[PDB]
Symmetry: C3
Subunit: 461 residues, 3 copies
Amino acid sequence: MNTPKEEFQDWPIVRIAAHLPDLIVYGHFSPERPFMDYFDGVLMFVDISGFTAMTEKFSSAMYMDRGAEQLVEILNYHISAIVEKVLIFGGDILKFAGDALLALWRVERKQLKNIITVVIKCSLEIHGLFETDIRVKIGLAAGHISMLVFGDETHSHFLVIGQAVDDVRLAQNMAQMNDVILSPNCWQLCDRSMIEIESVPDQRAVKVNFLKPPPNFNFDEFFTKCTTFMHYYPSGEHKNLLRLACTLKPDPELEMSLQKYVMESILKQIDNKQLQGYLSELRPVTIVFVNLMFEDQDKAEEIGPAIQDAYMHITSVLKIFQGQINKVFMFDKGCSFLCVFGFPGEKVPDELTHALECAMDIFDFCSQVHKIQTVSIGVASGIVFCGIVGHTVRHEYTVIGQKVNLAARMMMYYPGIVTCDSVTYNGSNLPAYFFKELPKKVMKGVADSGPLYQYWGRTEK
Amino acid sequence: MNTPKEEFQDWPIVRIAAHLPDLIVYGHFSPERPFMDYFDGVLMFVDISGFTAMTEKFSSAMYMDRGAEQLVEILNYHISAIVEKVLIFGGDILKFAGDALLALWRVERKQLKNIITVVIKCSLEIHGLFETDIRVKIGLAAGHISMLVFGDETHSHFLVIGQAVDDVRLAQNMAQMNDVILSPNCWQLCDRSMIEIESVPDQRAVKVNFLKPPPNFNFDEFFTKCTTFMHYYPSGEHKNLLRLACTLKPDPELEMSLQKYVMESILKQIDNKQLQGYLSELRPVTIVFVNLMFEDQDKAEEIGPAIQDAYMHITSVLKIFQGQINKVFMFDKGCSFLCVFGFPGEKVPDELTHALECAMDIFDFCSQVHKIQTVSIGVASGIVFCGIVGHTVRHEYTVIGQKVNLAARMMMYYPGIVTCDSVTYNGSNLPAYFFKELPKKVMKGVADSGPLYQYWGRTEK
Amino acid sequence: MNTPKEEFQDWPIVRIAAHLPDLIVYGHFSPERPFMDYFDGVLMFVDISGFTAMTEKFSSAMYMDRGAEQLVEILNYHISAIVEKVLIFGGDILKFAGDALLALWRVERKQLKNIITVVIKCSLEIHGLFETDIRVKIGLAAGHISMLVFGDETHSHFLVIGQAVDDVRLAQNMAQMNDVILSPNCWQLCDRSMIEIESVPDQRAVKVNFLKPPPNFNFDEFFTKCTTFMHYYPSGEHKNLLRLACTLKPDPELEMSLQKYVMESILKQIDNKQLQGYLSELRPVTIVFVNLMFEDQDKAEEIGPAIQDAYMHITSVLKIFQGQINKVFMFDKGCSFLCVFGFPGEKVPDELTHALECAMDIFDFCSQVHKIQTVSIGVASGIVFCGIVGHTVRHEYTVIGQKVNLAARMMMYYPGIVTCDSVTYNGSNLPAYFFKELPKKVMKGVADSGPLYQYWGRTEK
């Protein structure tokens, strides 16, 4: 009697799970919104802005109308290598953005010390991929972490929150290229016998100079011991897979839950109802970047309902014009929604006027939400790269480009108001007294932004 | 000198062969119609109505417009497991329907006894897949079997005919969930030392309680002996494949013959000229279910020409409105054609009026065909699931849904007339005196059908 | 720590490299046009006109509208087997046409003798594939070879030039089916102890009767020695691949260079922005076959600038009507451009008039190019097969059909003028005095061509 080799792991549920971390795939939590949970872990923030800054080169006519295709190819080649390292070291990739990937090792508190060593080693091997002009910067943090899941009956989003999340970003912003920077708490919790550090000026974070373990240390055996505490590390019959999630079987109630995190156009591709290459494009869009600041952004029990309330209103406003939420994340200050008008063939006429009117609606509503202290919205319009970025087994749809960066910086450097770039102002054709021409500010990563404006709105008020 | 590994087995001919049983793939018979052949074998009928009854759940708004995709996924997950069992036990899957899969072990007469044991074991292992609310019922039969191939210059269809075919359906209809029921002849021909049975009330068919072989029996060695009589069991270099048909090489005359069994839209997908997911859908259609009853439905030499003659007329009528024949099979009573109006983007306006006019044309013509004793036609209109169901290596396009079941039951419970449901009656807008409102009958598997009608037609007559 | 198996070799750059020989893939040469280089090698010309002559059979209604699909399938089945032989024997497939594939073993001069033995053996094993009514003819040549790369900023083409290139075609034209014919120089350079030949009447080329090596010869060990001189033979970790090019990694500057050789519609498929089967079709087109004859067609330093100058003008003329250059090659006499009007959904109205006007423009301009001695252009219109022909790892878009052959023969048998077939003449509706009805000539491979015409043009002149 024959025993043919198992073949099928390419079901829709598996394809959906590529777009999500294990935190959600295996999370099994209530469908109640907001949902909050609390745990401990180590975070790795990998700054990949050296890679994503290539968007402007691939906009050149030298690329003969295949810029987007060539960009996604080269970006995924490099980003895949990072993803593989993270996954083989037992991490969970939580999110990708144009500037960063964020990864988590969730563990019981007693094991943080040893897991930090694993994550340091992983970080050093990531840097080793790129020795020899593209490099990364790594921030590490550890401690208490909160998770928030928000959404409605058809859409779900998650965030991780708290001081360790704030810390990993602060650590990464301190790093130079090639550096691994530990948060103050990470340094407090780590195994100091493993590593040599130096101080970072005006900072309690430290830089890892060397991982130099004791004479009898064996990293492979140490790692094996550490896998005891990694719930989903592929093992046994499945030790050849990068993710347990590659083994997921059809389960309609699970797929119902998971698909709510994924854009409809991505699901269309997953269902083989759209060509696999259709979402890789350089296309004109309008970015609406919404930042919500809170009295204390580390307390999920306070900021969770506020985010949910804001999200309900944002989604209703975006619905009217097929705007989408591409990403949500915590910045140093606040919770940010990266909204896009124009992307998977969702491109309405008057995209500009509508974008500004939607921004103002969002600003007005969110300003009155309990516990939201300041709302700031940046609106920028131009060509951006759109595509699924990452590895075959772990990837996400992402938007990358100067105008994304510009809208992000506008909302931080012009807090408390709705701002727009020159493309948006000029194109709207709305009367000029609906705007105010703003002072020019020098902004991180932004080379001449052009004139910027406040959207003051219809009335003098 | 290198020896790279063979790679390509994904030719169009291979893809076509997935939709067909070995009976046809390796059949090499005349292109003359009708064609009849005669042999012996064991039949397995697996009632999968417990699975296909899920259509109505996947029509829920909870499935967010991916009902069809989720349905096909979960159905193929389970049906694939059944298919694998059948194929590894050396069976030939002949046909899939919404309610059933039918499999054949063709063997010389002397080997029926031992092959029945193999098929009993297979049946028990199928039941074992599902221990722990979805289960199957299995009927087995054995004896003489006739094959009929009918069609024209561009399309071919086949059927298996005779008392063993009638028997496997009767056996399956007796079964409860989890049962394996043997036809009277199957029980007469089997190895009684292998099994313990019990009587089925008011029946000469039996239920298998246990397969309990003699103390020195070894099933793997027994099975190996039995493979001597299985012409196409994958073996040798190909013992890792589920089907020999996976090794078919390009052969234009063979492909010409095989493609005649497959719908044009399926061939479009096979030729990579249509997206692989385009045929999975919940779509409104009109089902026209035609039943032809004969004096003796076991005599292929009589019923074959009659079916051919009916088919020629059916196909001409369906052509005018892009109706398709989705399936043909033998019921307990008669030969049934499952016709569909609306499916692979074949969706004409006035689908209802035309469906009724086509049904009446078919009824009138077939009623005058020699040897056709009674014609009955059921017409029902609504949302049905359409998709390729089965395993990667053996699958068929199938239509599943309440309205398919309803049209099937109408043609059996209202014999000798053309009947239609309320959707069809109301929608046609044809004058009401073209119909007769019928008495309500309680029908198998049908919960309130709504008012039913006879299509009396244009004249009082 | 797990070590999952490398997976991804299916990047766009890899897919692009399938359409190109190693001569270009690993060529790294200047982007300056024309570019010429010089080397030595052995050439194999495999006449596959016995296969491509099947186009007319697959135009039959028996093929039910899947002629193109069935043709490409059967052609690629057989052509793949030839490709594999060539590649495992260490050859570089340079180009495919309807009539032939051309392969190269580039080696230092000292190794030509041993490489000829390898190529003879390869040729004999190719013939052995087909023992038992479809066969091939093989011509071999050896000696000095020149390469020319020409094009503009967006498109590149290459050719190999010189007496060995002229010779391999002459050798192939002498061969009967099943023959291996060596050029005079090939016979002069070969290891005569390995083979028995016979004279070819009225020719200094020879026919290989037998490869019969000395008693102690071992071909596998001989071949291993010969791989020392084969730069890109897959080896080591990659000895299971048919081409090193399967291992190419993303490299934007390399991909920029390579994509210039590939048609935009092919790149669309490569980028998963078009269905993989969309380019296999039987479609009406107009072939414009341009032949340029030179005083000496073996001197790249003379004919290179002339070809470049002609190409610049051809491309500008074709641009206006989305005509494409499908292939360029050296014939016995001259450099030929196979141009096509109508193919990857590039199908303009008045295709005929425009084709004739473009031909005349080309003729007039090229006639005045320095060093071009005679220009001849054949214009023929009808159904032709279009598709990607070859192996998964090495294939090219190709056009095949009677009208391609007819346009090719018209340009050779009616030199110095623009000629057209009856379809083109009749269809153009241009006044009849723009043409001259020509004498009928009996042409190779052409069975009744119908009336042929010269396009004299608008004025008596």
